[PDB]
Scaffold this active site. Structure first.
Site, PDB file in Angstrom:
ATOM      1  N   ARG A 148       0.870 -11.896  -4.494  1.00 11.96           N
ATOM      2  CA  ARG A 148      -0.032 -10.634  -4.659  1.00 11.96           C
ATOM      3  C   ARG A 148      -1.026 -10.343  -3.319  1.00 11.96           C
ATOM      4  O   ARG A 148      -0.849  -9.540  -2.598  1.00 11.96           O
ATOM      5  CB  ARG A 148      -0.684 -10.908  -5.869  1.00 11.96           C
ATOM      6  CG  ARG A 148      -1.628  -9.730  -6.153  1.00 11.96           C
ATOM      7  CD  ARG A 148      -2.737  -9.612  -7.588  1.00 11.96           C
ATOM      8  NE  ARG A 148      -1.387  -9.672  -8.472  1.00 11.96           N
ATOM      9  CZ  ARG A 148      -1.871  -9.820  -9.866  1.00 11.96           C
ATOM     10  NH1 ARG A 148      -3.136 -10.252 -10.228  1.00 11.96           N
ATOM     11  NH2 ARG A 148      -0.856  -9.811 -10.847  1.00 11.96           N
TER      12      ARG A 148
ATOM     13  N   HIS B  59       7.877  -2.864  -8.716  1.00  8.65           N
ATOM     14  CA  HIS B  59       6.319  -3.395  -8.816  1.00  8.65           C
ATOM     15  C   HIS B  59       5.967  -3.124 -10.311  1.00  8.65           C
ATOM     16  O   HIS B  59       5.556  -2.027 -10.309  1.00  8.65           O
ATOM     17  CB  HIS B  59       5.736  -2.650  -7.642  1.00  8.65           C
ATOM     18  CG  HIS B  59       4.343  -3.454  -7.399  1.00  8.65           C
ATOM     19  ND1 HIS B  59       4.586  -4.655  -6.583  1.00  8.65           N
ATOM     20  CD2 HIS B  59       2.853  -3.162  -7.856  1.00  8.65           C
ATOM     21  CE1 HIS B  59       2.939  -4.941  -6.561  1.00  8.65           C
ATOM     22  NE2 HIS B  59       2.229  -4.287  -7.291  1.00  8.65           N
TER      23      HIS B  59
ATOM     24  N   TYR C   2      -0.957  15.654  -5.238  1.00  3.96           N
ATOM     25  CA  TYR C   2      -1.045  16.653  -4.125  1.00  3.96           C
ATOM     26  C   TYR C   2      -0.300  16.048  -3.010  1.00  3.96           C
ATOM     27  O   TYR C   2      -0.076  17.076  -2.126  1.00  3.96           O
ATOM     28  CB  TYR C   2      -2.596  16.826  -3.916  1.00  3.96           C
ATOM     29  CG  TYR C   2      -3.404  17.084  -5.109  1.00  3.96           C
ATOM     30  CD1 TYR C   2      -3.772  16.037  -6.030  1.00  3.96           C
ATOM     31  CD2 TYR C   2      -3.888  18.587  -5.277  1.00  3.96           C
ATOM     32  CE1 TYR C   2      -4.709  16.480  -7.235  1.00  3.96           C
ATOM     33  CE2 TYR C   2      -4.906  18.770  -6.546  1.00  3.96           C
ATOM     34  CZ  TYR C   2      -5.148  17.845  -7.361  1.00  3.96           C
ATOM     35  OH  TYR C   2      -5.730  17.953  -8.283  1.00  3.96           O
TER      36      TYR C   2
END
Ligand SMILES: O=c1ccc2ncc(=O)n3c2n1C[C@H]3CN1CCC(NCc2cc3c(cn2)OCCC3)CC1
Ligand SMILES: [Mn+2]
Ligand code: NA
Lengths: 481, 190, 473, 189
Positions: A24, A70, A114
């Site tokens: 991590r 993931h 976006y």
DNA sequence: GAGCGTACAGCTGTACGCT
DNA sequence: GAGCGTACAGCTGTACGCT
């Protein structure tokens, strides 16, 4: 049935802690990436989202990464990707993003629906020769996909872009560096295994932040390079210009790395509003797209601007320390490393990548040679080949008859049966010969590399040199001594 | 938040603590709504070994648990006023679930220790390999995890109080060094 | 300058029209709103068929968001979730793994946790989509192609129904029984002048996934005749001091909300005789709501009136016909669908014939090459380039450009013994297939029977018992 | 809430850009001239002031933020001389959902801030292509915000009677009149 | 100090039609 | 009435180590 509370706490907390450490929060020493970043960059590679190709939707990327590699939140994936595209976070951005990817004022990126993203040109160097058995692949969480354990990383990415990571029981905080400097350092190291940190620092001056600014002194740098731990003072670039009638003003054009500009200005205004600092009349963020970063601090007539500026360094993030703590993963374990260790681990990584790439190329070229030799036999005695196939009742019989008659291997026999009639035309035989001749040249070149470690090491040098010339740039952070 | 059960008799009642609504949905559909209550939390809960008391009491998630159990906290804690005789920790079968379990056990140890001593505190054993409990269907989650006939709950036993005091303080405590030491002492990579 | 009246009228008309023709209303042909059609097409492109394993929901949504649907993730996910709920869809279109919500209004697990794939019957919506049956259109950005309508080999609009809030208008179509609809379409296909009354011999009325009861045939008939009408959906409740047990609730009634209203009744002292109200509903047990009575028929009748235990389904069959919103009755809905099937099957046949003929042309070239292979090889061998070889093959053997091309693309392994018999066998089968396809294109009645057969097969494979009981009186 | 004001305090030269969210707002803040250009990102579909009751209208957050930013007040209490900016720019997305937000904002302006329209302070920006939330700062400035190169459309009130009818019909609570308008004017082609 | 950056988790407005 | 179902939009709480 039964479970002791002490045993449970120790087992569960170690399970979580180790996972955060190794899977991590901490970057690998070899490619300088965390799982999430390596899964983003690999995801981009698999779906063929290259610089020359058009941008793809961020939601599609995050969905592909989330689904395959993931098994975590979209937020953690998307925000990781956004960082790699920010020219104020990444010294060498690894992602090319179109749209609102955030500002230095700390306003976030637009929602992933976006924005669009793709690789940068230097990200190709992270992934160069990944499909050539240079690095090992491992199963994914569900086991329905394969993912790289480490990228080839043809430039020293750990030191170039740096890292910061809050793990468990420990953390990492590595400043970005200049690529021209780092590679020159690696070249120097490759020429002298017994080189000193001192001598390495002739190439690598110190950290190079994407936000430029100034580093105060070299003692901070030296200590962090020597021990992996050190404190480096980053100062804004500020000047004082006379304004007439005795008036002055402070103009700030560069701020310390990882400092939020809007938040820094709020702090200044907070000090002025609370009257914690004396002599400031006006505070304007005249930052524009044309000027870049620009903060104007107007100063009263009686007040001394130099004193105000110095006080601003102490009281605000205008001067900030970067607390270097160089913990990276080495062979799957968290290790506090010095500058030499990090470079050494990388060089060894490159040597392996180049050695494995050469071995792979030699394997493929010899396979292809074997095939071309079979085709050469076939075209030279085509009349006999046709007759042999035509007299065969099944494909299996043809297979056996070709192997027996022409002393061919099974693979050679298959390639002959898979041969198109268009190959019997005039141009194609010369094509097979020309392909086979240059292949023999290639095979011996690869053998020369595998024969001498000196040849292999020079190959590493030359490739890094090419990456230095293409992707190397100027120092931005000025180290004042 | 609380999806309570019909039975108001604490001896036969059990409450399941899940990570959220994603797991809470599976759990609510799969449960025996007669004797099984469900309280979905919201991710990582407060580390009560680190946080100040003021923050703990005002914490919404902590408050919901105290309200659900109906016992109170510390000295005010009344085991007789417990509305559930089984408090079952059902975190997701991953490393973060293991973390949330340590955070929960930390709260239980520091604020509701008699619950552990009475043996009211259990740990569910969901099947491994699933991303979350929300990844499971309600039928499979019920049979393998929640059904008294087939399930395998782990009853949290406090054997050594002094050893536990030190264990919680080391793992969950404010001092990093003690934690880093434990990690170095115990970590198995290969 | 910009006139405020002009701006208001134009900007509002833009939104209104868009919502109507590209959001809120389903197409009459396949019964899909854009978002549904985009979800299903995405699953098909990514080969997420029932035979293949469940795919991560987040990965589907990102794929749909990226290529087809430039809208919010929640909009797409909640739409996909609904198609996977057996209490929402009478014939579910998505096969979901994990928490996909309940009848109590609990939403599905975050999309990071769920997996999805097509149902068996969704394959039938998409069947023949690569056979030039429907018209493709550019996506929103012009990088991708998407279908304007699905082939929809079963009448999905009526089967699954639709509710949508548009601008100036809305839609509310109840689901139906597949067997009844196909039987209804089969009837229609034989009698274009068929009446609604006759159609109702096949299609008795709506069929809700949640089963339950419908009070009378009056509401059904008026809704089928005009496109608008109130249909009384009643819970299935039995009486057994005494208690009332509810095993089936009306369509779109939130079970937890309904109970709350019954409890709210007794608390407000609005109803008399209720002592206890319990939900003993489990997945294993099924729906079971028990209402205990003070020492029951009058109370149950009172509950129907005063709680959502009896709910009205306000039918309002508005759908897109020829790209325009149209209020339609039952016959119109079946006519428009059948006409769509007739087009689908026709276009598929044209495509098929076109494909078969192209292939039968290739096979002719291969036969000539294999029959005169000694000559073929020498012609190729004496050639310098592929172009020269192409010309030499066409001239000497009177081959087409495509035939000569296919000969040069032939592998040496096709020179073997069984290969010649394999080519002729495939060719003889083509000749008959070509013949079959031309018969279909040359006789309307033959094409119509082919539709009948294909519909009947889907009926026999996917047709199920009616769930909702229509009580008369 | 999330207003990024212009540094200048002379309304005659100042302008505020109303955007649909932080996605558009972020790009806009980068690209703007922070000396004369303010940015107010709303939080999506704004309340319909024609259908909504005054209690709710005055309770609404984005409505309150707009009222505060303009500094004019609503109704008779409205004052033109107290305008913080002499250019209120509606910069909606591009898409159809933008056009809707446009009609909701003009409904609010007409009903509660009519003299603002009358004076000619209300403008409509035209983004060049899909949404402007996907645009870079330099791109957005040059095309839409740069007074040297931009094309702002000034909203003008011609017929008050006709405009009162238009708002009542389109945005009012009676569906029929709105259905009718669509039926009469819609060209599907 | 507080926030750096990967992790966990979830909610509330708004439009629009009908009944 | 309030909610059915596609659309627009965004924010806050938690863990963790470090200077
Ligand atoms: O749960 C809450 C509560 C309050 C709140 N306030 C503001 C806010 O922004 N949010 C609030 N929330 C939540 C979050 C809104 N959330 C909606 C979903 C969106 N998801 C983005 C996404 C995810 C995926 C996509 C695309 N886009 O495709 C690939 C896989 C998954 C992220 C923002
Ligand atoms: Mn979880
Ligand atoms: Na001026």
């Amino acid at each position: 049935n039964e479970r002791n509370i002490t045993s449970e706490m120790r087992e569960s907390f170690l399970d979580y802690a180790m996972s955060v450490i190794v899977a991590r929060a901490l970057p690998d020493v070899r490619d300088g990436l965390k799982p999430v970043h390596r899964r983003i960059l690999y995801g981009l590679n698999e779906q063929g989202m290259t610089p020359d190709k058009s941008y793809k939707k961020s939601a599609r990327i995050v969905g592909d990464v989330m689904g395959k590699y993931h098994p975590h939140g979209d937020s953690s994936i998307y925000e990781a990707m956004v960082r790699m595209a920010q020219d104020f976070s990444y010294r060498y951005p690894l992602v090319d993003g179109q749209g609102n990817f955030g500002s230095m004022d700390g306003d976030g990126a637009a929602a992933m629906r976006y924005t669009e993203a793709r690789m940068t040109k230097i990200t190709l160097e992270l992934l160069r020769d990944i499909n050539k058995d240079t690095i090992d692949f491992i199963d994914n969480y569900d086991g329905n996909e394969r993912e790289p354990s480490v990228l080839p990383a043809r430039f020293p990415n750990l030191l170039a872009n740096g890292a910061s990571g809050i793990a468990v029981g420990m953390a990492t905080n590595i400043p970005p560096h200049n690529l021209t400097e780092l590679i020159n350092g690696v070249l120097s190291l490759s020429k002298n295994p017994d080189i000193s940190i001192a001598e390495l620092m002739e190439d690598i001056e110190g950290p190079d932040f994407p936000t430029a600014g100034l580093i105060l002194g070299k003692s901070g740098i030296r200590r962090a390079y020597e021990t992996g731990r050190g404190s480096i003072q980053m100062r804004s670039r500020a000047v004082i210009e006379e304004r007439g009638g005795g008036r002055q003003r402070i103009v700030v054009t560069e701020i310390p790395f990882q400092v939020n500009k809007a938040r820094m200005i709020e702090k200044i205004a907070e000090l002025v509003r609370d009257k914690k600092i004396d002599g400031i009349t006006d505070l304007r963020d005249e930052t524009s797209l044309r000027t870049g970063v620009r903060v104007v601090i107007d100063v009263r007539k009686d007040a001394n601007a130099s004193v105000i500026l110095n006080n601003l360094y102490k009281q605000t993030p205008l001067q900030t320390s970067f607390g270097v703590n160089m913990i990276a993963l080495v062979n799957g374990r968290p290790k506090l490393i010095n500058l030499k260790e990090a470079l050494v681990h990388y060089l060894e990584h490159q040597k392996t990548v180049v050695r494995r790439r050469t071995q792979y190329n030699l394997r493929k070229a010899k396979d292809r040679a074997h095939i071309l030799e079979g085709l050469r036999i076939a075209l030279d005695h085509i009349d006999e080949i046709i007759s042999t196939i035509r007299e065969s009742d099944t494909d299996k019989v043809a297979m056996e008859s070709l192997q027996q008659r022409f002393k061919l291997s099974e693979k050679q026999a298959q390639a002959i049966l898979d041969m198109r009639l268009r190959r019997l035309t005039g141009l194609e035989r010369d094509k097979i010969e020309a392909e086979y001749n240059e292949l023999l040249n290639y095979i011996s070149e690869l053998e020369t590399i595998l024969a001498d470690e000196e040849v292999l090491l020079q190959l590493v040098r030359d490739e890094l040199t090419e990456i230095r010339d293409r992707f190397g740039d100027d120092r931005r952070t000025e180290i004042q001594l | 938040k609380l999806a309570d059960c019909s039975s108001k008799s604490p001896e036969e009642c059990e409450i399941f603590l899940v990570e959220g609504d994603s797991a809470g949905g599976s759990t609510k559909s799969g449960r025996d709504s007669r004797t099984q209550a469900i309280l979905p939390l919201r991710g990582k809960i407060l580390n009560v070994e680190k946080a100040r008391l003021d923050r703990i009491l005002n914490n919404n998630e902590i408050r919901q648990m105290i309200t659900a159990f109906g016992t109170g906290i510390g000295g005010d804690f009344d085991l007789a006023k417990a509305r559930y005789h089984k408090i079952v920790i059902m975190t997701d079968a991953d490393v973060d679930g293991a973390h949330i379990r340590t955070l929960l056990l930390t709260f239980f140890y520091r604020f509701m220790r008699p619950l552990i001593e009475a043996g009211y505190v259990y740990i569910a054993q969901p099947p491994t390999g699933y991303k979350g409990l929300g990844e499971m269907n309600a039928d499979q989650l019920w049979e393998t995890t929640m059904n008294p006939e087939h399930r395998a709950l782990l009853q949290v036993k406090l054997e050594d109080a002094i050893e536990a005091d030190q264990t919680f303080e080391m793992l969950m405590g404010d001092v990093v060094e003690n934690r880093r030491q434990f990690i170095e002492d115990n970590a198995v990579y290969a």
